[PDB]
């Protein structure tokens, strides 16, 4: 009864809508960017936090928008403000961009399935 592993299946690269309900607590993830504004990316999702409990965001996602506010060209500081001030219901449009993300983290690369690997 040979198993069927998720881990080979390609990670979808189209934009997705994620709605997180977090009341008045943190969203539970970290973003990375530059003050240049070349994309804002998720670097880390906290185990058990609202973003984790959504189950639909991952390290390497680019945050395209929050509550209709375009963040494709945001600074990290101003993106954080937007997220922290987004209210109890947070509607994120995200898009998986592991190649771009992998430039941030040491000894990281993307494998054949699109997964981020760190050596």
């Amino acid at each position: 009864g040979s198993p069927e592993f998720l881990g080979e299946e390609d990670i979808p690269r189209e934009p997705r809508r994620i709605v997180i309900h977090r009341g008045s607590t943190g969203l539970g993830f970290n973003i990375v960017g530059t003050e240049d504004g070349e994309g804002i990316f998720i670097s880390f999702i906290l185990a058990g936090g609202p973003a984790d409990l959504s189950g639909e965001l991952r390290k390497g996602d680019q945050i395209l928008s929050v509550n209709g506010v375009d963040l494709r060209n945001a600074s990290a500081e101003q993106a954080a403000i937007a997220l922290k001030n987004a209210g109890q219901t947070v509607t994120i449009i995200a898009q998986y961009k592991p190649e771009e993300y992998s430039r941030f983290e040491a000894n990281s690369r993307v494998d054949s399935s699109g997964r981020i690997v760190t050596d």
């Binding site: 969203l27 993830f29 970290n30 973003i31 990375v32 960017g33 530059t34 003050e35 500081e77 954080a80």
Partner: peptide, 8 residues
């Protein structure tokens, strides 16, 4: 580095 990381 240009780079900035923050928790939200």
């Amino acid at each position: 580095k240009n780079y900035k990381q923050t928790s939200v």
